[PDB]
Amino acid sequence: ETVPVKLKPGMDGPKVKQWPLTEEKIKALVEICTEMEKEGKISKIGPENPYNTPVFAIKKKDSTKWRKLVDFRELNKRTQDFWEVQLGIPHPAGLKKKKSVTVLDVGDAYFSVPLDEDFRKYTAFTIPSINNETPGIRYQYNVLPQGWKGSPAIFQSSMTKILEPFRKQNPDIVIYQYMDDLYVGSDLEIGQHRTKIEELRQHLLRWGLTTMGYELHPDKWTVQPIVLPEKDSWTVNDIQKLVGKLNWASQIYPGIKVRQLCKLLRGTKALTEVIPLTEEAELELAENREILKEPVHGVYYDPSKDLIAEIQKQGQGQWTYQIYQEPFKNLKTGKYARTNDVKQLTEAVQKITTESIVIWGKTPKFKLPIQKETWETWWTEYWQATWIPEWEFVNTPPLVKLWYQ
Amino acid sequence: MPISPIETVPVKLKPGMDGPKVKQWPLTEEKIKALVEICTEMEKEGKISKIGPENPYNTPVFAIKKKDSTKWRKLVDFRELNKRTQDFWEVQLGIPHPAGLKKKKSVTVLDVGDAYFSVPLDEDFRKYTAFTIPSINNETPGIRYQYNVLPQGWKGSPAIFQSSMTKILEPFRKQNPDIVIYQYMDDLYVGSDLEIGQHRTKIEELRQHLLRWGLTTPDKKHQKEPPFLWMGYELHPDKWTVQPIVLPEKDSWTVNDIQKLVGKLNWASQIYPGIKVRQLCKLLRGTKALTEVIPLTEEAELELAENREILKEPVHGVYYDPSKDLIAEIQKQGQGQWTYQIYQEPFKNLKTGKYARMRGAHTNDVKQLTEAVQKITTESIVIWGKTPKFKLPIQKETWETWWTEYWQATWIPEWEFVNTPPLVKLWYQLEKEPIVGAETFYVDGAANRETKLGKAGYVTNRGRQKVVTLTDTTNQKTELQAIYLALQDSGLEVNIVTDSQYALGIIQAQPDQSESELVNQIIEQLIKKEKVYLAWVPA
Numbered sequence: 032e033t034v035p036v037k038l039k040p041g042m043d044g045p046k047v048k049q050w051p052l053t054e055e056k057i058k059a060l061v062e063i064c065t066e067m068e069k070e071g072k073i074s075k076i077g078p079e080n081p082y083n084t085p086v087f088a089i090k091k092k093d094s095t096k097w098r099k100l101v102d103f104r105e106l107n108k109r110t111q112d113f114w115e116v117q118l119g120i121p122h123p124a125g126l127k128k129k130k131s132v133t134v135l136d137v138g139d140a141y142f143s144v145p146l147d148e149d150f151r152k153y154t155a156f157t158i159p160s161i162n163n164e165t166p167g168i169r170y171q172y173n174v175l176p177q178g179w180k181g182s183p184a185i186f187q188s189s190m191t192k193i194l195e196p197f198r199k200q201n202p203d204i205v206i207y208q209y210m211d212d213l214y215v216g217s218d219l220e221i222g223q224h225r226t227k228i229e230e231l232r233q234h235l236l237r238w239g240l241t242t243m244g245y246e247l248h249p250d251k252w253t254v255q256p257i258v259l260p261e262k263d264s265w266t267v268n269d270i271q272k273l274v275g276k277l278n279w280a281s282q283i284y285p286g287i288k289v290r291q292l293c294k295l296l297r298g299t300k301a302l303t304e305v306i307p308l309t310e311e312a313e314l315e316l317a318e319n320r321e322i323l324k325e326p327v328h329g330v331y332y333d334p335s336k337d338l339i340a341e342i343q344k345q346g347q348g349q350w351t352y353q354i355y356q357e358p359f360k361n362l363k364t365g366k367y368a369r370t371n372d373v374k375q376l377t378e379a380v381q382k383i384t385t386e387s388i389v390i391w392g393k394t395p396k397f398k399l400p401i402q403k404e405t406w407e408t409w410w411t412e413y414w415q416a417t418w419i420p421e422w423e424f425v426n427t428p429p430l431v432k433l434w435y436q
Numbered sequence: 437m438p439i440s441p442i443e444t445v446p447v448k449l450k451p452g453m454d455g456p457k458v459k460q461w462p463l464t465e466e467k468i469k470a471l472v473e474i475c476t477e478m479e480k481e482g483k484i485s486k487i488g489p490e491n492p493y494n495t496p497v498f499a500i501k502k503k504d505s506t507k508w509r510k511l512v513d514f515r516e517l518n519k520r521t522q523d524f525w526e527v528q529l530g531i532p533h534p535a536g537l538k539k540k541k542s543v544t545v546l547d548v549g550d551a552y553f554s555v556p557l558d559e560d561f562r563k564y565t566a567f568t569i570p571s572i573n574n575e576t577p578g579i580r581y582q583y584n585v586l587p588q589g590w591k592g593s594p595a596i597f598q599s600s601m602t603k604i605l606e607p608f609r610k611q612n613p614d615i616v617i618y619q620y621m622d623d624l625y626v627g628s629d630l631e632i633g634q635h636r637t638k639i640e641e642l643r644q645h646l647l648r649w650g651l652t653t654p655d656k657k658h659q660k661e662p663p664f665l666w667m668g669y670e671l672h673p674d675k676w677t678v679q680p681i682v683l684p685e686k687d688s689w690t691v692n693d694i695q696k697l698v699g700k701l702n703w704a705s706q707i708y709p710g711i712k713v714r715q716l717c718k719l720l721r722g723t724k725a726l727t728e729v730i731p732l733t734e735e736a737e738l739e740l741a742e743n744r745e746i747l748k749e750p751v752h753g754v755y756y757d758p759s760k761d762l763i764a765e766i767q768k769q770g771q772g773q774w775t776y777q778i779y780q781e782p783f784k785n786l787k788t789g790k791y792a793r794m795r796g797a798h799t800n801d802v803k804q805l806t807e808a809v810q811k812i813t814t815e816s817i818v819i820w821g822k823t824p825k826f827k828l829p830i831q832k833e834t835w836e837t838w839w840t841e842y843w844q845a846t847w848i849p850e851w852e853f854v855n856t857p858p859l860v861k862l863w864y865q866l867e868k869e870p871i872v873g874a875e876t877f878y879v880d881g882a883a884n885r886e887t888k889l890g891k892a893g894y895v896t897n898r899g900r901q902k903v904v905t906l907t908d909t910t911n912q913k914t915e916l917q918a919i920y921l922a923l924q925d926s927g928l929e930v931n932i933v934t935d936s937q938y939a940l941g942i943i944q945a946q947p948d949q950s951e952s953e954l955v956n957q958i959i960e961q962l963i964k965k966e967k968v969y970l971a972w973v974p975a
């Protein structure tokens with residue numbers, strides 16, 4: 032029996048255009064879809080289905096084989112009441128406190144559960160054709176699809192039964208389901224932790240579930256503080272940059288002072304001129320460093336608001352990032368380090384989304400410092416995650432990069 | 437004549453909507469007579485069927501007979517039914533491009549006869565297509581009909597016809613994977629690499645398979661021969677071109693004449709290299725009426741004359757060879773104009789094209805070149821399913837200096853430098869550190885929002901100062917004026933401190949082109965300097 036799914040009132044199903052694909056990705060998808068159709072997982076559809084969701088082909092996490100990725104971002108936004116209010120999966124606060132967190136792909140579990148007949152039409156997708164030789168190949172889902180947030184929401188009851196003996200035997204292990212993955216955290220020694228993962232894989236293997244470094248280590252996640260340089264000689268220019276960077280942090284951190292340092296900039300002096308540091312300025316500098324190395328007082332995650340992630344290209348394969356709900360009220364800051372700009376940016380996006388899932392159980396909306404078309408053409412060539420976050424394109428403000436440098 | 441025995445596509449109305457109930461307006465006797473004759477013939481052919489009085493739906497009918505002709509045509513106004521009919525999926529994602537066609541030994545055109553009338557309509561939906569032929573002066577009940585096939589002008593016909601052809605071709609495609617069949621509207625373009633005799637054997641077998649499903653196609657004597665005139669193109673056995681282009685010679689050009697000329701030049705630009713439309717497009721800027729005469733500027737006259745020389749002799753493109761790479765080359769033509777050619781064997785182009793600089797932007801040639809590469813990459817994946825190898829007029833060192841210093845993630849797929857001037861370069865660079873022995877200008881710009889009057893100025897470490905008044909200005913323009921002042925009054929080496937993130941952001945991206953007269957003046961100054969260092973301080 033199927034769980035009846037309803038759309039949010041006033042909104043219709045997704046009607047998103049299919050992005051052009053290379054010949055090797057089209058052939059990969061045709062082969063995967065031919066096989067899924069034989070297995071009854073999907074069915075060819077008629078023109079009376081006016082819905083569409085984009086489809087892509089990516090390289091797997093564990094192998095060189097092609098895998099189908101459906102971008103259900105619109106269908107997910109349009110079904111939010113079902114997967115978040117009606118069948119919401121609660122997020123554990125202990126997951127980010129674990130020594131090791133292992134991510135296991137469990138998307139193959141959903142192909143067993145059939146999808147409600149009246150909802151299937153909303154899962155429509157099209158395999159495009161080179162030079163528009165033929166009209167695309169149109170299909171819809173007969174079972175819970177990978178990428179749709181309603182799939183873990185409906186499978187939740189079955190996942191609880193599959194995991195019950197493992198959780199009873201290991202009460203200190205935290206298991207969290209997010210979309211197609213299980214997040215498994217423990218405080219065990221790395222060898223005992225890996226042994227418990229291999230044990231959990233055997234439990235999933237009994238139900239047909241044959242399943243970034245190896246593990247994530249959230250207890251070692253330490254914020255990228257606002258860096259104030261340690262100098263022997265201080266020019267007028269260095270003081271100006273420090274005042275600008277402290278003026279920025281004073282709007283976020285309660286207690287930032289700049290009066291004594293700001294006084295040193297009296298006049299219209301040459302940028303290269305050396306200025307000696309006073310006792311009051313040196314004390315103020317050390318008190319600011321102490322505040323910057325601690326979390327932001329007064330900033331809390333509001334579950335009713337979206338998370339935002341901003342990224343800045345710093346040069347030499349270094350990228351900085353911040354996550355917040357209200358501009359510049361930073362919930363987390365970090366850095367990503369390394370082949371090419373687009374590849375590095377996708378890797379950083381996936382790393383930040385994964386941390387966001389561990390900490391808050393949700394993906395942030397990204398502000399990407401790239402041209403919309405460049406990103407739209409190449410992001411798929413390097414993507415390895417089975418989820419896709421929301422993103423928009425920004426023109427990185429001057430000095431925003433400078434303050435987080 | 438035949439109506440396909442294919443399974444019908446279930447059709448629905450929009451949620452909460454009933455079928456149309458539009459009153460039939462009384463018609464003249466002449467029109468009623470023509471409609472009765474047309475409808476009797478269609479009813480005999482199975483296309484429409486008489487209905488009882490139980491059906492409450494109605495759609496208006498009309499009859500039109502041209503002055504030159506003795507032929508009457510039936511016109512049904514499906515506007516109301518189309519408004520109430522469900523949405524359908526898009527027919528095609530794009531249109532085939534001739535450059536994406538391969539070199540097949542034989543190619544055949546099979547146009548389906550009476551396409552919509554050869555496909556049945558969902559039985560449960562037929563009732564919504566009800567129409568009435570009114571009696572003389574609407575005195576007595578009219579003659580009522582409903583469609584049994586896809587009606588002309590109804591919303592679902594193009595999608596339902598296409599899906600019916602796809603379903604029908606499915607088994608023939610599985611059992612003949614090496615035969616090419618392009619689907620386009622009511623046509624099938626069939627190609628193969630078999631010898632002339634066995635190709636006709638496959639064509640007859642295809643025509644016969646189609647016939648088994650109610651679709652009639654032209655026989656060997658009635659099928660078209662090359663060159664095929666398709667959608668503004670000419671397709672020949674080993675080359676393709678655009679249909680003849682006639683550039684008119686007029687004493688006075690109107691907005692309408694210029695718009696038609698730009699359309700024709702844009703269409704020719706997909707195979708004629710070097711076509712330009714910037715100056716002609718500039719003439720179309722304004723609120724000018726269609727018949728308003730626009731005098732040609734000297735620049736538009738020069739551009740038109742250069743286009744005429746490009747089109748004086750025919751130019752053709754070649755077909756695609758899937759076993760060879762695609763090469764794309766781009767050239768800068770000046771004033772934000774870019775031209776490109778795509779070939780596999782030099783220099784036999786499959787197609788050409790152009791790219792134009794974005795309007796109202798502070799930009800440079802490196803950015804424009806990156807945008808043109810992106811546009812070409814997208815177009816190539818659609819036509820051929822793969823990205824071309826690029827030959828660009830930019831040094832690897834110039835690109836490396838740009839991408840490693842730019843705040844935005846940027847990338848160009850596999851490319852090689854080609855020395856085809858004008859080459860792409862950055863015309864100035866800003867210093868990374870404050871200059872020693874150079875004067876530091878602390879610039880400031882402000883504008884009163886109430887009066888729109890502003891002041892632009894500076895104070896230096898050397899005691900120099902200046903203040904200038906500006907009328908009908910903004911904070912942004914006074915901040916740029918303040919920077920320009922410092923550039924004008926300083927020597928070859930200068931340090932500039934500003935509180936304008938806006939101005940800093942524009943200059944840090946090394947623009948050489950701008951819509952703004954003020955940004956262009958800042959550029960001329962920046963280029964002539966030896967060392968410029970720009971720093972920012974909070975207000």
Ligand SMILES: CC1=NC(=O)C(F)=C[C@H]1Cn1cnc(C(F)(F)C(F)F)c(Oc2cc(C(F)F)cc(C#N)c2C)c1=O
Nearest residue numbers: 532537539540543616618625626627662664666671672673
């Ligand atoms: C190799 C060719 N031989 C010819 O005789 C000739 F005139 C043209 C070509 C190019 N060509 C190569 N391949 C196809 C095909 F669609 F792929 C299929 F027939 F094989 C063509 O068929 C088209 C393709 C298109 C359009 F889809 F591009 C329009 C028309 C028309 N009219 C035709 C005939 C086609 O024209």
